[PDB]
């Protein structure tokens, strides 16, 4: 549980460095920078923002290696630790 | 094959929550917000259908987050308990 | 390597069966077919190409939850059972 | 950390190849070709950039099957060998 909230607090950080970066790089909202941050780390990718700038697509290309890693972490731990046993406790009437 | 079933009532209901969000809040067809859900927590992101209220993108996020987990946890016991044997099964003559 | 051949040719067979399918319902040349089938159930979804039609929605739904799990299982053997020992080989001088 | 080092290269290599192809056949800038081939591999797809060439359609069938075992490979070392011994280190004050 101490393993889920570093996980969790780290995907945070890393979110809001994506936010931050976007928005300025990219002159996205920070809304739509943070919706990116996270198609893009999750790799759904839906491409509706994509960015313009070199500076936006090498950046991309370093946050992917080095987000990736960490949210599905925390999406693993999430599943594993957190769902799994919500919904096994449901199953007890 | 308990878990199985589970994991099917509990992939049904996480996409029909989608396909009444997407519906509503981004004016989709039913089947355009099925098939957009499924896109989305499979992480293929075709991204034709993409969200463009605020509501929608913040959705999207805590959706992917939540979902991911259930569908993949869905795809690969269907992969390793359904059609691993299946196929198993097929190659005695 | 008996299970390399037999995801092989199950990977191939599903890919036909992809091909087959949005060449005839959504009107791809072949080639479009194939490579859509392939972008879809690697999840890469580049979304050039993306089902118009609601058969065309239906089935990349089911197609998708029945094909990643193939798809992957031949990835991930092709990766482990294929290229490691190939590239370690490699590392001998 | 020889792993590592092997991994850290074969994935530049890989992606290399992929700039070459992609610069040459598909007509990008090397650096779209780089950020196609990155975004190709971990699966992100965001399909600013799609082959418009039946030869850059096989090619990218091709290097997705070879590429994502490699890369997602390295990905995972780099997660659990390097990014998590870190982040634990900083978590004793
Ligand atoms: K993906
Ligand atoms: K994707
Ligand atoms: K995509
Ligand atoms: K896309």
Tied chains: 1, 2, 3, 4.
Aim: hydrophobic share 50%; no cysteine.
């Amino acid at each position: 549980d101490k393993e889920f909230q570093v996980l969790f607090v780290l995907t945070i950080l890393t979110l809001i460095s994506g936010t931050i970066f976007y928005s300025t790089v990219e002159g996205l909202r920070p809304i739509d920078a943070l919706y990116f941050s996270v198609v893009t780390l999750t790799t759904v990718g839906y491409g509706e923002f994509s960015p313009q700038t070199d500076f936006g697509k090498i950046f991309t290309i370093l946050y992917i290696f080095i987000g990736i890693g960490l949210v599905f972490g925390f999406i693993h731990k999430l599943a594993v630790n957190v769902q799994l046993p919500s919904i096994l406790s449901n199953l007890v009437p």
